[PDB]
Design an enzyme around this catalytic site. Structure first.
Site, PDB file in Angstrom:
ATOM      1  N   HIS A   8      -0.263   7.773   5.060  1.00 33.65           N
ATOM      2  CA  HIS A   8       0.482   7.312   6.413  1.00 33.65           C
ATOM      3  C   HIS A   8       0.823   8.523   7.256  1.00 33.65           C
ATOM      4  O   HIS A   8       0.999   9.633   6.576  1.00 33.65           O
ATOM      5  CB  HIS A   8       1.564   6.301   6.305  1.00 33.65           C
ATOM      6  CG  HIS A   8       2.716   6.904   5.133  1.00 33.65           C
ATOM      7  ND1 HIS A   8       3.506   7.813   5.908  1.00 33.65           N
ATOM      8  CD2 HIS A   8       3.057   6.631   4.018  1.00 33.65           C
ATOM      9  CE1 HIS A   8       4.547   8.134   5.081  1.00 33.65           C
ATOM     10  NE2 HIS A   8       4.058   7.354   3.893  1.00 33.65           N
ATOM     11  N   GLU A  74       4.550   2.991  -2.070  1.00 31.55           N
ATOM     12  CA  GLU A  74       4.935   4.159  -2.860  1.00 31.55           C
ATOM     13  C   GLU A  74       5.641   3.714  -3.705  1.00 31.55           C
ATOM     14  O   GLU A  74       6.096   2.744  -4.118  1.00 31.55           O
ATOM     15  CB  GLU A  74       5.470   5.276  -1.645  1.00 31.55           C
ATOM     16  CG  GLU A  74       6.114   6.442  -2.278  1.00 31.55           C
ATOM     17  CD  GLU A  74       5.019   7.142  -2.695  1.00 31.55           C
ATOM     18  OE1 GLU A  74       4.590   7.833  -1.566  1.00 31.55           O
ATOM     19  OE2 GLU A  74       4.555   7.432  -3.774  1.00 31.55           O
TER      20      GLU A  74
END
Length: 171
Positions: A8, A74
């Site tokens: 990202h 994550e």
């Protein structure tokens, strides 16, 4: 299996150097810019994305309508969420650098993170684009014998679970 993993775009904690896991930060203006640039540089394949804002927004700006998967998140840093890397206890720094023996209080261990990530990848039966996070990309790269944390808004294509195909970074 051809899989494109996209890290990202940047958030504020990228420049600040803070551990960013499940803390749901939005992309910075530049982060959104990085995402826009990905549009046209990524193949038109089915897309999946971490359900965290920064990943979802990156996918949207890149021109995709991904299926959300918490499995692409994550690692959960627990009490270490938001901790400055600079002042992280040497034992934690080493655990993250060597990518092993890391289990933050209230968080997820690196071995559990790897299990989660690889189990998700195993379920992909056809080529796809995955909007995810630096730690996920690192877990995949390291398992394929390669190191480095690709820059924000960049991507890496791999033949899972055999080899890296290409690393793509735009300016």
């Amino acid at each position: 299996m051809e899989l494109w993993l996209v890290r990202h775009g940047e958030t504020l904690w990228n420049r600040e150097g803070r551990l960013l896991g499940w803390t749901d930060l939005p992309l910075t203006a530049e982060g959104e810019a990085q995402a826009r640039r990905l549009k046209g540089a990524l193949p038109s394949l089915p897309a999946f994305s971490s359900d965290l804002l920064r990943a979802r927004r990156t996918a949207e700006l890149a021109g995709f309508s991904p299926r959300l998967h918490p499995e692409l998140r994550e690692i959960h840093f627990g009490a270490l969420e938001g901790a400055l890397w600079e002042t992280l206890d040497p034992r934690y720094k080493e655990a993250l650098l060597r990518f092993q023996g890391f289990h933050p209080p209230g968080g997820e261990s690196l071995s559990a993170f790897q299990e989660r990530v690889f189990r998700f990848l195993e379920g992909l039966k056809a080529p796809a684009v995955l909007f995810t996070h630096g730690g996920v990309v690192r877990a995949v790269l390291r398992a394929l014998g390669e190191d480095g944390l690709v820059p924000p808004g960049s991507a890496v294509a791999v033949d899972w679970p055999r080899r890296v195909l290409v690393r793509l970074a735009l300016d």
